[PDB]
Design a protein around this ligand. Structure first.
Ligand SMILES: Nc1ncnc2c1ncn2[C@@H]1O[C@H](COP(=O)(O)O)[C@@H](O)[C@H]1O
Lengths: 113, 115
């Protein structure tokens, strides 16, 4: 699970509002939401950042997106949404555990930050 | 047609020009014509999928491949300080081209919220 706050969430050591879980990922609402709906999908495998993801992780990363789109549908995001992965300082990555943001429930703007 | 009817299908089939960064049997990476950061490119599947909301379960590996190719291209382009990957879905996402694609933006500080 790794040595970050997302590791603690995966291990159930600290609370989060969990939307979905399977054997390889977890989806939960962001504690600092930037839209009326704002959740994260994260792998249980501790990949610190997308830049170090291995080729073998390919389908796992895609799994985050499929889970993300399924959760968005369940949460009634029928007008759309934005998915985001942040890498490093320029990317504004807040936690060094790969996470896919899903934001919706309002018009998302351009540029995306 | 392989690649679909959108402008991105035409790019895939070399019918309209693009500044291509990477190409394989599954995907294509090329620079965005309206960049929102000093470096701003797209990674798209060669298979037409209109939007992420209609992607099939068995599209998992392909979607992941877009991300892996995205991060490799970013490294090759020297985005060592980081970058942001984005998918715009539907009206609230601001989607304008209905062929699934991953934006990769870098070369400046990205801000929060992401739009
Ligand atoms: N012919 C083209 N070549 C490269 N990028 C394009 C082209 N046409 C549109 N785009 C970009 O594709 C994106 C489509 O918007 P969206 O669907 O919200 O991602 C925008 O960033 C456009 O600038």
């Amino acid at each position: 699970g790794g040595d970050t706050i997302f590791g603690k969430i995966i291990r159930k050591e600290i609370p989060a509002k969990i939307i979905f879980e399977d054997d390889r990922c977890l989806a939960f609402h962001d504690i600092s939401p930037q839209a009326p709906t704002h959740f994260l999908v994260i792998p249980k495998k501790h990949i610190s950042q997308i830049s170090v993801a291995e080729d073998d992780d390919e389908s796992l990363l895609g799994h985050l997106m499929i889970v993300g789109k399924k959760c968005a549908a369940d949460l009634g995001l029928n007008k759309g949404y934005r998915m985001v992965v942040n890498e490093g300082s320029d990317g504004g990555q807040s936690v060094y555990h790969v996470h896919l943001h899903v934001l919706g429930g309002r018009q998302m703007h351009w540029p995306p930050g």
